[PDB]
Amino acid sequence: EVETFAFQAEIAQLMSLIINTFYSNKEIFLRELISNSSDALDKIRYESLTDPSKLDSGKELHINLIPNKQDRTLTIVDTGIGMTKADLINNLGTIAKSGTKAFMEALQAGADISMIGQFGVGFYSAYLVAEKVTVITKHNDDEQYAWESSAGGSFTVRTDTGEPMGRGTKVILHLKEDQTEYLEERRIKEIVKKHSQFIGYPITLFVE
Ligand SMILES: CSc1nc(C)nc(N)n1
Numbered sequence: 001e002v003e004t005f006a007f008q009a010e011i012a013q014l015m016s017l018i019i020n021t022f023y024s025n026k027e028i029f030l031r032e033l034i035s036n037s038s039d040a041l042d043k044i045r046y047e048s049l050t051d052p053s054k055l056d057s058g059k060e061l062h063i064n065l066i067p068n069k070q071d072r073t074l075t076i077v078d079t080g081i082g083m084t085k086a087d088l089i090n091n092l093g094t095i096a097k098s099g100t101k102a103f104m105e106a107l108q109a110g111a112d113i114s115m116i117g118q119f120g121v122g123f124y125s126a127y128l129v130a131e132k133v134t135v136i137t138k139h140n141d142d143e144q145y146a147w148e149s150s151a152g153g154s155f156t157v158r159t160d161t162g163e164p165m166g167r168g169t170k171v172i173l174h175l176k177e178d179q180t181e182y183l184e185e186r187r188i189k190e191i192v193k194k195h196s197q198f199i200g201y202p203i204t205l206f207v208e
Pocket of ligand 1: 036037040078080081082083092093123169
């Protein structure tokens with residue numbers, strides 16, 4: 001059913017720095033996530049050029065932003081490449097151990113938390129605004145899995161029995177209570193325009 005894993009020591013540290021350092025520019029999480037979505041879409045697009053059947057699990061290449069004021073979640077959905085079970089457990093396909101080290105050194109030489117994406121670890125910036133992150137992913141080579149973590153050093157992975165998704169990743173951010181500004185339509189729009197204005201895939205902002 002549910003497997004529980006410990007994060008490697010450098011990720012646990014990376015997540016704790018993110019959660020504990022006072023840093024008011026939290027809004028960069030969205031860009032970091034849309035930027036992961038865009039890389040994952042590049043990937044399925046490049047593979048499909050030589051094997052069109054990779055798009056049998058969906059032809060449309062895009063990003064959806066889904067706010068839900070009742071559940072208090074912001075969900076970032078793409079129909080990108082997805083992750084296999086092994087890649088989800090291996091730091092969601094990131095080079096988190098070496099990127100974190102390098103990032104921490106840059107933080108001592110004048111870098112700041114907004115540069116997290118330059119180190120291949122921007123996914124973890126979700127924890128600037130989220131108390132819990134769930135990630136649902138479907139790779140063409142595998143079943144559908146849910147990853148989840150509220151930090152504190154562990155994450156869980158299970159087969160996902162929610163609704164089948166064709167292919168891609170949904171990052172579901174359960175927001176901290178003081179961060180609900182990220183569920184507001186004109187907030188999200190503003191942030192997309194400031195940091196992700198020109199991206200190679202269409203972004204749809206869902207309304208409620
Ligand atoms: C490798 S596919 C992928 N990986 C991450 C971290 N996020 C998304 N959206 N896709």
